[PDB]
Design a protein around this ligand. Structure first.
Ligand SMILES: Nc1c(/N=C/[C@H](O)[C@H](O)[C@H](O)COP(=O)(O)O)[nH]c(=O)[nH]c1=O
Ligand SMILES: Nc1c(/N=C/[C@H](O)[C@H](O)[C@H](O)COP(=O)(O)O)[nH]c(=O)[nH]c1=O
Ligand SMILES: Nc1c(/N=C/[C@H](O)[C@H](O)[C@H](O)COP(=O)(O)O)[nH]c(=O)[nH]c1=O
Ligand SMILES: Nc1c(/N=C/[C@H](O)[C@H](O)[C@H](O)COP(=O)(O)O)[nH]c(=O)[nH]c1=O
Ligand SMILES: Nc1c(N[C@@H]2O[C@H](COP(=O)(O)O)[C@@H](O)[C@H]2O)[nH]c(=O)[nH]c1=O
Ligand SMILES: Nc1c(N[C@@H]2O[C@H](COP(=O)(O)O)[C@@H](O)[C@H]2O)[nH]c(=O)[nH]c1=O
Ligand SMILES: Nc1c(N[C@@H]2O[C@H](COP(=O)(O)O)[C@@H](O)[C@H]2O)[nH]c(=O)[nH]c1=O
Ligand SMILES: [Zn+2]
Ligand SMILES: [Zn+2]
Ligand SMILES: [Zn+2]
Ligand SMILES: [Zn+2]
Lengths: 361, 361, 361, 361
C-alpha cells in the first residue's frame, strides 16, 4: 500500500459516514496530517452545516500549521451556505493539500484549486479519483450535465408482465422487494409518476422508512390535467407535489389545485416531452429523480435515453396473457440495430425475488 | 467422512461415466468391498447391455463372497435385457447391500429389496439418497409420474421482449448464451417447437455441441400442416421429426410428408392439447422434452401447468414497445391469486446476459 | 445491528491514533442523533483531547438527547480539566454505549455510575473483544503492572538457531525477517543479551517505511563486557539501556554514559528477568520484544514471563550435537511440568513458516 | 480441457481406488474408449491379481475391437505374477494407446511401448504424466534408484526438544497426532530405529491400524549388537526384525538371536553407513523405510542426504534445557552456505499439534 493513498482512503471512509444526511450537498471527507501523524479528521455530516475541512482543521488544532490535508473533493471557493473551505485551508497555514477530484459544481469548478495555489499552497490531485467518483454519482452527474440523475424502477413477473390481462397486480413481488424499493425513496430528491398511476393506485408516493427528515418531491406527469382532485398526492399535505401539464389543462381546475399547494408547470407543447421535464426539475433544484410508475412513462424515458439506472424486480411467477401489460409500453425500437446496449451492474436476490440493475453503456 | 458414504460416492461417480450412452436407461454405479478392500467397480455404460452390478460382481470374482456392495439404484428383479441383478447378488454370496434409493416405477419398486431380504442379505437404504436423485432426475420423473420431464427455454430482452414490434430479433442474447443453451439439446430426448417458429426462422433443432451420439427427436406442433415442406427437418432429416396435427390437416400432405420419414400424429380435437401430446410421447418412450417454440406454445404448457423447469436468458437490452412480442402469449392467468408460485433455483451470468432458472413448488 | 455498526466505527476511529499516543490508550467515539452520525472522535496526540472531547465538540448542538459510543470507559477523575464522563453529562447525551471498563481495578465502573447517576442510560459489552484487542499490550501492562512480552526466534526446521560454529547469518528468508520487523513497531522496547551484540552487532532498529519513533534497545550484560564500538552504543539511532551488576567497571559505565547509554545496576549476582521487567515498567515501558538470547529466552520461559511466542522456521536442517538450540538454560525436568501453550496462528511467509503460540490458563 | 486428458484423469482416479491393496505393485488404472464412449474401466485392486488393462478390456467386451485405451502406466510385457497386458492390448483389436508414463524398471521398461508399436498400435504417451508420478511416488523412486524411498519422522516440542534433560518423553504430542503417525507404519514396508531407541523404550514398532494385514519389517541399527536380549522386537514374533551390525558384534550373541528369527547383517566398516544399509534393504525387496530412529540416526540420514521426505510433529510446548536432546544430532553442517534447502510440502494441524512435512529440492 501507499501512504498518500492510505490518507485519501481514510478520507473516503470518513465521507461514507454522512451518507444520507447531507441532502443536496455531496459526501466529503478530510484528514489532516502533521509530522506524519493524523491530527484531524472530518466529514460533511449535515446539510447546511460545517464541511469536512472545517471539522478536520478545527480538530487539527495548532498542528494545522504547516501540515498536509487530504480531501475527497476540491475545497469549495464560494460564499454560499458555508464559508469557503479554500480560505479556511490557507488561513490555517496548511502547507500542501491533496484533492481526489475537482468539484464539477459550476460555482467551484477548478476555482478552489486556483485560490489555494495563488496563495502558495501546493495542490495535488488524482489520488483515488475512481472511488471519489463512486462516492457521489448523482451529485456529479447533475453538476456535469445540468440534468437530474434518473433511475427507472419496475416490478414484474418472470415472463415480463406487470399485471394480468384484467389489471390484477395485488401481489407480484414479495414484501421484502417492496421494502427494498423504499430505499430509493430516500436516495432520490423526487419520485416521478404518470397520472395513470394516481388514478389507478392513488398512491401516497411518500417514504415509509425510519429516518424521516425530508420527504421527496412527488412529480406527476398529467398531459390534460385529469388527476382526481381528491387524490392523496393532492390532499395529504405530507409532501411537495409538482404536476406537469399542457395548455389543454383546465384553467379553473388548475387554479383549484394550486390552492392546495400543488405547483403546476405548464409546458408549451402538446405532448409532455420528457427532456423538457428534466431540465425544469434541474432548474428548480431537483438533482435526482426516481421514476416509479407508468410503463408508458418508462417508455418515454427509455425512448429518449433519459435514464442513468434501470432497476427491475422479477418474481418467480408467470402471468402470461397476450393482452397482459408488459414492462415497457409506448413507441419502442423498430429493429435490434437501434436498441441501445446496457450492462448489468448488480444481480442480487431479495426474498424469493431477483433484482437486476443495469446502466447505459 | 463415513467410509460407507465414500463407497456410495465412488459408485455415484462411476455411474456418471455412462452419461449420454445409456439412452432411456438410468445411470447406475456399483462397488464391491471385501474385508475393507475395493474388489469390484461397475457402471451402466451401454443401453441394453450389462448393468453396473454385473460388471462389478464379475470383476470382484471370489471376493464377492461375504462382501458388501453399494449401488446407486435398487438392483433389478425382473427380466428386461439382463437377468435380475438381485439374483446375481444373492448367488454371488454377497452378505450386505447398500442402496441409495429405490426403483422409480411403482410396480417394480421394492421388489428387488424383498428378494434380497428373502435370501438373508442385509439391505441398508438412504445413503447419499439425494445425490442419487439428481443423477437421474428426468428418468425418476418419467417412471414416477408417467410423463416426460418438461423444460421450457426462452430468451428475451430485459423488458421481456422476444423481438421488436416489427418482428426483428436478430440480436438479443450473446452468442455465449446461445451456446450455453445447446447443452439442453443433449440432455433431452426431444426438442419441441411450433410451426410458427419453423416458417419464421426455419431452425435445424439439432445438437451442435461436440457430442453427436443421436439426434434429439424434433417435435413440431402444427394445426392444419401449414409447415413449409420446402425447408427444415423435412429436407434432409438429420434426425427424427414428429408432427402433431388436427383432423383437418389436409390429406395429400399428411401422406406426403410420411414419404420422407416424418411421423405424423393426428389428434382428435380441433385444438392441439398439450396434455395429450406429452402422453403420446410418453407412449413413444420419450422421457424428456425441451420446449423452445413460440410464446404461444410456452403459454399452453404454462397454462396447462405441464413443466418442471423454466430457463430464461435475459440480455441487457431494452426493446420496448406495445405489441412487441412478449415471452409467453395466449390465455394466461386473469387473477393474481391464480398465478402458480415458482422458486428460483439458479442465477448465472453468462457472457453479458443473465440466466434465470425456476422450478415449480 | 446499528449498535455494532457505531461501535465498529468508533473502533476504526481509535486506530487512526496508533503510535501517536505514547502511554495513553487508543480510544474511539461517535455521537449519534436521530439516527444520524453527528460526531466522531479519537485520541490522536499524547496529552491532548480525549476521543469524547472531539466527538462531542463536533456534534455541537446535536449532542443534546444524542447517543454516544465509546470504546473505553469515559475517564472520571478530576484533573486540570473535567473528566470525559462529566463532559457527556453536560452535553445532554441520554445514552452511552461502552465497549469495556477501565483496566485499573480502582477506576473500573467509576465513569459508568457517574453517568447513570445523572440519569443517563449506560450499556456495556458491545464489541468488548475487539476493544480488548485494540489495546492488548496497554491493557496487560495496566492489569499486571509488568510489560507485555513477546519472545521471538528464528530457527532451522530442527530447532537450531545457528550451526555448531555459530554461523547463523540468515537461517530465515528476507520476507521472514521483514515480517519480524513489524514487532519492532508494535513494542516500546527491543531486548537481547550481550551475547547477541558480541556475535551479531545488530542495530535492533525499526526500519519500516514509516517510523515516527524508535523502540528502546535493552541489553542484558552482567559484567558490562559489551564492545564499546557496537552499533547499539555508537549509531545514536535509538535509546540504549543496559542492565549490569556490581561486577561492572565504573570507568566503563562513565564512558558509556557519555555516549547517552542508560545503565541500570542490579544488586544481585545474576540478572533476574522479573527484576528487569519490574524496572522497565517503572520507566514506563509497557511492551518488550525479546529476540536474541537462547539463554535469555530460557529465563523468560522458566520464569513464565512471556505473553506470546513467535517462531520462524526455515525449510532447512542444520545438524550438530553442538549446534545451539532455541531455549537453553535449565528447562523443565518432567513432561508434566512443562506448561501447555496453544497455537494462535500459523502462516507461511516466503518459503518459511511462522508459528505463534500463547500460554493457556 | 480436452477429452484426451479427461479419460486419463479418470484412469488415474480409478487407479487411486487400489491404494493400500497394491502392496509392492503400483496403482494403475485403465479406461477403454470405443467410438467416443467409455466401454471399459479397470484398476489394480489386489496384489498378485489382475492388472488394470485386464479388468478394463474384459468389461469392454466386443467394444474393444478398434478402440482406444488410456493407461496410467506402460503396459507390462514381462511374465511376473500375471502375463503381458501389452500382449492383451494387441490381441484385443485395440488400435491406439495412451500411456501416461513409461515403466521405471530400466530393463523391463521401454519394451511395452515397443512390443505394442510393433503390432501397428499408435502409442501416444505423456498425458498427465505429472499426476501419474505422484500416484506411485515411492515405487518409482525405488525402481529408478534401486534404493528404498526414505521418510524421516520426528515428534518434538516447539523448541526442538524430543525429551527433557532427564530423558523423560512421556508424550510430547497428542494421541491424535500419534495416530496420524501410525498411517505411515502402514504405507512403508519397514520401520527403522537405532538400538538407543530400543534399550530406552523397548517399543514393538508394530502397526496398530484396522486391517493390519502384513506388519512392516523392523530394522535396528546396532553398532556393537548391544540390543537387549529381551525386547518386544527380539521376542514379540509379531513382525520380522532385521539388525545391522559391524565386526565388533559378539559371535555368540549373534547366533542366539538368529535362532529367534532375527536376520542379522554384518557390515565390514567401523561405523554403520546409511548408504550401505539402504543398499542391503533394497536388495531384500524393501522399497520404503519409515525412519523415526533417534536424533543420531536422523543426523546420519540428513548428513548423507539419504531421505526423500521429512515429517515433524510439533507440540504447543516448550521443554527447554541446554542438555535436553534435540531433533537432529550428529555432525551436522558447519556453515549456513553448506546447509541444504528443503521445501515445505504440507502444513496441517492435528488436534493441538502441528504437522510439518518437507522435501529436499
Ligand atoms: N404491484 C407491485 C408494486 N406496485 C406497487 C404500485 O406501484 C404502488 O403504486 C406503489 O407501491 C404505491 O406506493 P405507496 O402507496 O406510496 O406506499 N411494486 C412492487 O415492488 N411489487 C409489486 O408486486
Ligand atoms: N433469437 C434468439 C434465440 N432464438 C431462438 C429461436 O427459436 C431459433 O429459431 C432457434 O434457436 C434456432 O435453432 P438452430 O441453431 O437454427 O437449430 N435464442 C436465444 O437463446 N437467443 C436469441 O437471441
Ligand atoms: N539469525 C536470524 C535472526 N537473528 C536475530 C538476531 O537477533 C539478529 O541480531 C537481529 O535480527 C539483527 O537485527 P538488525 O537488522 O541488525 O536490526 N533473525 C531472523 O529473523 N532470522 C535469522 O535467520
Ligand atoms: N514420544 C513420542 C513419540 N515417540 C516415538 C518413539 O519412536 C516411540 O518409540 C514409538 O512411537 C513407540 O511406538 P510403539 O510403542 O512401538 O507402538 N512419537 C510421537 O509421535 N510423539 C511422542 O510424544
Ligand atoms: N460538502 C462539501 C463541499 N461542497 C461543495 O459546496 C456546495 C455546498 O456549499 P455550501 O452552500 O457552502 O454548503 C456543493 O454544491 C459542493 O459543490 N465542498 C468541500 O468544501 N467540502 C465539503 O464537505
Ligand atoms: N440400469 C440399471 C438398472 N436399471 C433398472 O432397469 C430398467 C432397465 O432394465 P433392463 O431393460 O434389463 O436394462 C430401468 O428401467 C431401471 O429401473 N438397475 C440396476 O440394476 N442397475 C443398472 O445398472
Ligand atoms: N499393476 C500394474 C502393472 N504393474 C507393473 O508390473 C509389476 C507387477 O507385475 P505382476 O508381478 O505380474 O503383478 C510392477 O513391478 C509394475 O511395474 N503394470 C500394468 O501392467 N498395469 C497394472 O495394473
Ligand atoms: Zn467547503
Ligand atoms: Zn440390473
Ligand atoms: Zn476522557
Ligand atoms: Zn500388466
Amino acid at each position: 500500500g501507499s501512504m498518500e493513498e492510505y490518507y485519501m482512503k481514510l478520507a473516503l471512509d470518513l465521507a461514507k459516514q454522512g451518507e444520507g444526511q447531507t441532502e443536496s450537498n455531496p459526501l466529503v471527507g478530510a484528514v489532516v496530517v502533521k509530522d506524519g501523524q493524523i491530527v484531524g479528521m472530518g466529514a460533511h455530516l449535515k446539510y447546511g452545516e460545517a464541511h469536512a475541512e472545517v471539522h478536520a482543521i478545527h480538530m487539527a488544532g495548532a498542528h494545522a500549521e504547516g501540515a498536509d490535508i487530504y480531501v475527497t473533493l476540491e475545497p469549495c471557493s464560494h460564499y454560499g451556505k458555508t464559508p469557503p473551505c479554500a480560505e479556511l485551508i490557507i488561513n490555517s497555514g496548511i502547507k500542501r493539500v491533496f484533492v481526489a477530484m475537482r468539484d464539477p459544481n459550476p460555482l467551484v469548478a477548478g476555482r478552489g484549486i486556483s485560490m489555494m495555489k495563488e496563495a502558495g499552497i501546493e495542490v495535488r490531485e488524482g489520488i483515488l479519483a475512481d472511488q471519489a467518483e463512486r462516492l457521489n454519482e448523482k451529485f456529479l452527474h447533475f453538476m456535469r450535465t445540468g440534468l437530474p440523475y434518473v433511475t427507472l424502477k419496475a416490478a414484474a413477473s418472470l415472463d415480463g408482465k406487470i399485471a394480468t390481462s384484467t389489471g390484477d397486480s395485488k401481489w407480484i413481488t414479495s414484501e421484502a422487494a417492496r421494502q427494498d424499493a423504499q430505499q430509493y425513496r430516500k436516495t432520490h430528491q423526487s419520485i416521478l409518476v404518470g397520472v395513470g398511476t394516481v388514478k389507478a393506485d392513488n398512491p401516497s408516493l411518500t417514504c415509509r422508512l425510519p429516518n424521516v427528515t425530508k420527504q421527496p418531491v412527488r412529480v406527476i406527469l398529467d398531459t390534460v390535467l385529469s388527476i382526481p382532485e381528491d387524490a392523496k398526492v393532492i390532499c395529504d399535505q405530507i409532501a411537495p407535489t409538482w404536476i406537469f401539464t399542457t395548455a389543454r389543462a383546465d384553467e379553473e381546475k388548475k387554479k383549484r389545485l394550486s390552492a392546495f399547494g400543488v405547483n403546476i408547470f405548464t409546458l408549451e407543447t402538446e405532448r409532455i416531452q420528457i427532456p423538457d421535464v428534466l431540465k425544469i426539475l434541474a432548474e428548480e433544484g431537483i438533482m435526482s429523480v426516481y421514476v416509479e410508475g407508468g410503463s408508458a412513462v418508462h417508455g418515454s424515458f427509455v425512448k429518449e435515453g433519459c435514464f442513468q439506472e434501470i432497476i427491475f424486480y422479477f418474481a418467480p411467477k408467470l402471468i402470461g396473457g397476450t393482452h397482459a401489460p408488459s414492462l415497457i409500453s409506448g413507441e419502442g425500437f423498430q429493429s435490434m440495430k437501434d436498441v441501445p446496449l446496457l450492462q448489468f451492474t448488480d444481480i442480487t436476490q431479495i426474498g424469493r425475488d431477483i433484482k437486476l440493475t443495469a446502466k447505459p453503456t
